[PDB]
Design a protein around this ligand. Structure first.
Ligand SMILES: [Mg+2]
Ligand SMILES: [Mg+2]
Ligand SMILES: [Mg+2]
Ligand SMILES: [Mg+2]
Lengths: 114, 114, 114, 114
């Protein structure tokens, strides 16, 4: 139900080997680790969760953008990029969290499909 | 030393009355409230802090984008837009945190000057 | 060698049925029609050209964003979105022209892979 | 009535000395030169035109991003960034054309005020 795709706006390439951590908000409002991985050679991260596990709730997807830019020898602004959203059952649904990275800027878009 | 500017990509206008909360990471690794405010009719938020108060640290600027869109009748994807960065680690700088908002997407850029 | 992918930042969806025109710059500096199509249900447009046809030169990819937003009943700013670039033989290469659309804003990124 | 503002997403700075050419579509459907200039140290370009001269029409604002990046030692993807729009079709407006530049990506937003 949840995929992450990351692009590099400096090199015009997939952003490879980006660490991605997903958290789910707990009843005590803390962030509990939910799933994680690293983006592939295609800048994508699949298989984070399953339909059974990915119930409604508030999720945070954190991309370690600082480590990514450091590895490329480029001084970045952000510590990380965080994407926070509520998962909503309103029919069958797939979430793609897309991110476009520059050293002092990023954009993120949600592509939500049936 | 810290200003926030927000635009609405649907209307082609400043994003007015966006609530902004700034936090600073404390010694115990928790997020301590640092300053807050709301964007003006120009989409800008000035006067959050001072050169004296704005010491080195890791800061989080949280824009309440969900409330912004809902007040305009739109159910957006994100809970908020969070911008996390180390500030002033090589001396005082002036930071403009810019954000561009769409219902299922946002971008953020930092302009940093000496 | 050339693919186009378009996303809709208002609906968080592929941008479907977007008209795409590709032009190649001629010797007299005019834009000559090269290929065209409409994005699919996945927001993608494949099969525009072939390795044999897609030689080095200056190309323009035009997305009819105005007609797209009009069909959705949304007032847009731009007449269209234009992406202009030189194709460069520097090893085996695939170009993806990606675009993210809002009514008063768009971004475009080139993903260039081997 | 027409201002251009450009930021550099690699440096987190204004994009200084970006050449800007404005064209207006003539009655014979060709692009007639309308105004030009370059961005200041603030990344802004003011004084392109006047309320009297800036009549209804279809305008193209072309930013020479390729020359900008090459002067900084970067071989970018795009030849330029072109922004094409109908202006003043329901009376005089003020237009800010904003652009955010990366070597293989750019975004542009319009802020339109009455
Ligand atoms: Mg429900
Ligand atoms: Mg120190
Ligand atoms: Mg060559
Ligand atoms: Mg009229």
């Amino acid at each position: 139900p949840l995929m992450v795709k990351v692009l590099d706006a400096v090199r015009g390439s997939p952003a490879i080997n980006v660490a991605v951590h997903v958290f789910r908000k707990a009843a005590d409002d803390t962030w509990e680790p939910f799933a994680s991985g690293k983006t592939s050679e295609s800048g994508e991260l699949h298989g984070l969760t399953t339909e059974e596990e990915f119930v409604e709730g508030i999720y945070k997807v954190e991309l370690d953008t600082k480590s990514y830019w450091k590895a490329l020898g480029i001084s970045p602004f952000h510590e990380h990029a965080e994407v926070v959203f509520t998962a909503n059952d309103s029919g069958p649904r797939r979430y793609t969290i897309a991110a476009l990275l520059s050293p002092y800027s990023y954009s993120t878009t949600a592509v939500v499909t049936n």
